[PDB]
């Protein structure tokens, strides 16, 4: 079992924190917020680095490029912005979605960006030119998450419409629709680090590990509270193999991936833990919470 304990609490955002992500090189933590700002922090010591500003309304997601040099954010101003970490410059503003942008990610090569929106579409953008390459009529309700697979050949999307869908990056064809015997909103999805599974959250207090190629649910993770918000979930692979997620009872939940048992609950936040992230090489978890809390917390474990 892990032994995560609190090391740092990071105050700075003036509204709910919407996402936290460690840079692939392990150096930084990026946070986004309803306060319209992205903030960069030292991953190991929590030391504030810089604020990145530009969006006109709150931000729902931020993501790193594979080389840790760029970030992309999605906002209620209906744009995405591509940022250069070193300079803080907005290199491109991606305009095309007709409603709020909810989620975003680079592909492994960091030459494409995928985005999901309240306009019910998934869009694929060229990073270099900042132009919209494809618009997929993906869902019948807002798109809650989008993620590229290990080689970038596939995109997985999730939606409040209750569906998880797999898309061919090149053609834009819908290759698969995944759903279980109940039809609750799907609030989050991502491929596993090894690329052969997807982890999906639904708003019935349940996380599920799918073999997406076979279309079978392999594992379910329960114990947490999730009926309202699109809470991030993660694979922890640096020490023991865990599943990590936020919860609406104000705690971070950690499960054993294989046994599906709850192995730890991290207490400290004063509001719903909306976002969590796992560091790429060290046993470090970042967590952040909604309007009544406004803080980010860094937890560390020897296992």
């Amino acid at each position: 079992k892990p032994n995560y304990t609190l090391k740092f609490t990071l105050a700075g955002h003036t509204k709910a924190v919407s996402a936290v992500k460690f840079s692939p090189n392990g150096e930084w933590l990026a946070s986004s917020s309803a306060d319209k700002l992205i903030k960069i922090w030292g991953a190991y010591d929590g030391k504030f680095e810089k604020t990145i500003s530009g969006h006109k309304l709150g931000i729902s997601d931020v993501a790193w490029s594979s080389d840790s040099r760029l970030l992309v954010s999605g906002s209620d101003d209906k744009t995405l912005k591509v940022w250069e970490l070193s300079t803080g410059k907005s290199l491109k503003t991606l305009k095309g979605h007709s409603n709020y942008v909810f989620c975003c990610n680079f592909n492994p090569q960091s030459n494409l960006i995928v985005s999901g929106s309240f306009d019910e579409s998934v869009r694929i953008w060229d990073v270099r030119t900042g132009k919209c390459l494809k618009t997929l009529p993906a869902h019948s309700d807002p798109v809650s998450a989008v993620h590229f697979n290990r080689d970038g050949s596939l995109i997985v999307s999730s939606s409040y419409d209750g569906l998880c869908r797999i898309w061919d990056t090149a053609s834009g064809q819908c290759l698969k629709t995944l759903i279980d015997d109940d039809n609750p909103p799907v609030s989050f999805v991502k491929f596993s680090p090894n690329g052969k599974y997807i982890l999906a959250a639904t708003l019935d207090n349940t996380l599920k590990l799918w073999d997406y190629s076979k279309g079978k649910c392999l594992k379910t993770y329960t114990g947490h509270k999730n009926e309202k918000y699109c809470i991030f979930a993660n694979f922890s692979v640096t020490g023991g193999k865990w599943i990590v997620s936020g919860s609406e009872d104000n705690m971070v939940y950690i499960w054993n991936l294989q046994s599906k048992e709850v192995v730890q609950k991290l207490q400290g936040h004063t509001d719903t833990v909306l976002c969590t992230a796992c560091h790429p090489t060290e046993n470090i978890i970042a967590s952040a919470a909604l309007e009544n809390d406004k803080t980010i917390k860094l937890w560390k474990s020897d296992t």
């Binding site: 709910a16 729902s60 709020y100 909810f102 309202k228 918000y229 699109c230 909306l274 309007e291």
Partner: peptide, 9 residues
Amino acid sequence: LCSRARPLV
């Protein structure tokens, strides 16, 4: 609040 910080309608 931004979209992710708004609860299920």
